[PDB]
Design a protein around this ligand. Structure first.
Ligand SMILES: Cc1ncc(COP(=O)(O)O)c(CN[C@H](C(=O)O)[C@@H](C)O)c1O
Ligand SMILES: Cc1ncc(COP(=O)(O)O)c(CN[C@H](C(=O)O)[C@@H](C)O)c1O
Ligand code: NA
Ligand code: NA
Lengths: 410, 410
């Protein structure tokens, strides 16, 4: 019994397990992983150094690690239909760094989605290595439709002449057209990288068309909709690019991979390969549309782009509260966790924002369905509308507890 | 249960556990972590996004995570006597990247230990981001003594004018004079960074002098001698540098931290604060020295620098077998796993090398003492001397099993 040695730490772990059980987790980038995923991360694979790749390592006694890493790779290939995979990146951010390193040079120009419009930090923020090393020039969404305008993006690319175009987002609710992004890249001789971190589980379930046949390289996190452990993954169909990607991950950016986490990737990928995973995908789509629909009908709330065809959506809350930060703090008091989030053409400070981002994967992984989704959104509307009324929130909190007990986390 | 859903994966996991049990692991960068460390990283903390730092995160639902991360931070500070710590780096390599990003600019000149004399890839190898982004100039050890020669290093630094000197190694066996390194740095107006990855547990146990009072910034892995989960850690006593390092880790290089690994870091740091860790360290030192003495006394092997004052040593094997790769493969035949390794002024190919590197931490963590260590080294000598006598190898392999049976891994 090692927990008696460190009660401060293990009490804190217990408190987080209860926090998670008693919350409605709507943070769009989160999920609830299986016990098998957790168990694999909890193995003595953490003891093993394995610099290199399967069969070409720098240390003895890696033949079993090699089987494990090869399972992950072969499963990623099979699930996503790619000819090559690298399962070593420690995160989505490292995965993306490796692609840039493989395809372009410092100072080269890159187009990626504007951060207010849902692009990631590693898609060119000035405070990220991405913006510091490469010349990123952002494309945006249409100001009226809040949709990607492929003609506008094509004309911009024709002016900019990037070496690389990055597609993918952290907060865009609509289907991204990867065929068009590749047309656009081809029109200027650019590579196309798709960062499908947020939608990888939908791509896997068949609810979002795949970037894989269109992107020269596809990156993703394994956590998020794919419902795996925290880490990165890189896919391509080009063998020469694959070799570069491999050198870039190691020795380029990383040292020894986290082979216990890689085992957990293999676990998650086999889960996503199972027919049940499609049904999970299907519910993710439905649950998010149901919550979105509630806000759509309510007159003091607008939903960015008018709705969603994926797992997430953004809501402008400024009619009802001052900003997204506030909205987040309030929903938190009724045990509903999400995050504030800039909306396209955000007017307010980055640290306030005008919006909230909502996602369905975690509640869907707990077994909730359309009715519960709808109710959760009613509750959010209701709490925001009564934010100054402690008696209302206290009641909403009570009702939330009935729902969380009914769909227990583990 | 979940193992039945995925037998190919769980069969491999179970096989690695057994392989670790049935091999004598002398790889100097490995250790055997506690069940607690592994359990921490097998928790549902993996489901939480926690970009930012305690109390200044970009998501709600982070109050307990803050408790965990803060425990990790305060325990690092305490254990190493530092005023600031950052526990988010995913790896040692990422820790190092962050520090360069914080202290210097692309193209700046940096001095780093030579890869053949024990410097790490991230200390300036042309295949690493380190050598690609910065102008690294290497220093070596003295050709005759195989020791750091602080006068030569100073003369070189005066010629080269680095903005940063990096100290620390993957394969140096003697005590490093950090006060001397800082004196050199101060003399040329350079920063000093110390990468204490290999030695951090010995710094913690009291058996290696701390670089913390002398380096502007100290990096380390939490795995290796410290006996923690895989990951990185950064320390400094300078508040302005600490702000830079934090911004460099996130949003500079990483995104979301691995909070389950961070819990595991907290676990390991408390283990290392326990008085028993001092005894572990002492055994690490005695066991490595007992192994080295066998090779010192044998006339056909030479230990680099004539011995060790830490957890590791290198042996020139070229009088008995052709190169280090051969020696590595021979030992593997008798279930002793190590790695071939360049020696200082290496004349053979990097793929072959003249050396093997041996370390004590793993066997020490299984509870082996001096007599077992000495016996292990005798078997290594005997295996290499009889590498073409299958019958001898077979007998050694059988003796090894008796020993491993007697010191169960967990
Ligand atoms: C599209 C995308 N790519 C890559 C990453 C980085 O992966 P990490 O380095 O493993 O964290 C994220 C994280 N997305 C966060 C999120 O969506 O909650 C975002 C706000 O910064 C992402 O949304
Ligand atoms: C001194 C030093 N710093 C940093 C690292 C990076 O750590 P990672 O990114 O967490 O793997 C290592 C790994 N050391 C290996 C080893 O010694 O076995 C080395 C030779 O490549 C190291 O020895
Ligand atoms: Na509305
Ligand atoms: Na000798």
């Amino acid at each position: 019994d090692y927990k008696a040695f460190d009660p401060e730490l293990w009490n804190a772990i217990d408190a987080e397990a209860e926090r998670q059980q008693n919350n409605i987790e709507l943070i769009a980038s989160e999920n609830v992983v299986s016990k098998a995923v957790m168990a694999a991360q909890g193995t003595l694979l953490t003891n093993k150094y394995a610099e290199g790749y399967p069969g070409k390592r720098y240390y003895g006694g890696t033949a079993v690690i090699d089987v494990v890493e090869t399972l992950a790779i072969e499963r990623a290939k099979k699930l996503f239909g790619a000819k090559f995979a690298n399962v070593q990146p420690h995160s989505g951010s490292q995965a993306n760094a490796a692609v840039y390193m493989s395809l372009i040079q410092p100072g080269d120009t890159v187009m990626g989605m504007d951060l207010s419009a849902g692009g990631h930090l590693t898609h060119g923020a000035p405070v990220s290595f991405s913006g510091k090393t490469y010349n990123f020039v952002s494309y945006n969404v249409d100001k009226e439709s809040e949709l990607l305008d492929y003609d506008a993006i094509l004309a911009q690319a024709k002016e900019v002449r990037p070496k690389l175009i990055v597609a993918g987002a952290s907060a865009y609710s609509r289907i991204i057209d990867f065929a068009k992004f590749r047309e656009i890249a081809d029109a200027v001789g650019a590579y196309l990288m798709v960062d499908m971190a947020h939608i990888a589980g939908l791509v896997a379930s068949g609810h979002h068309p795949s970037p894989v046949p269109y992107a020269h390289v596809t990156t993703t996190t394994t956590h998020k909709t794919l419902r795996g452990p925290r880490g990165g993954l890189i896919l391509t169909d080009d063998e020469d690019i694959a070799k570069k990607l491999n050198s870039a991950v190691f020795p380029g950016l990383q040292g020894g991979p986290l082979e216990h986490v890689i085992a957990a990737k293999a676990v998650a990928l086999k889960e996503a390969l199972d027919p049940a995973f499609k049904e999970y995908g299907e519910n993710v789509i439905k649950n998010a549309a149901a919550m979105a629909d509630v806000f759509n009908q309510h007159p003091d709330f607008r939903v960015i782009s008018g709705g969603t065809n994926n797992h997430l959506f953004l809501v402008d809350v400024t009619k009802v509260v001052e900003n997204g930060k506030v909205a987040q703090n309030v929903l938190e008091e009724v045990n509903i966790t999400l995050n504030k989030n800039s909306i396209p053409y955000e007017q307010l400070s980055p640290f306030k924002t005008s919006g909230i981002r909502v996602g369905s994967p975690a509640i869907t992984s707990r077994g909730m369905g359309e009715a519960e989704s709808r109710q959760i959104a009613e509750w959010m509307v209701e709490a925001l509308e009564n934010h100054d009324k402690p008696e209302v929130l206290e009641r909403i909190r009570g009702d939330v507890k009935v729902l969380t007990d009914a769909f227990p986390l583990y």
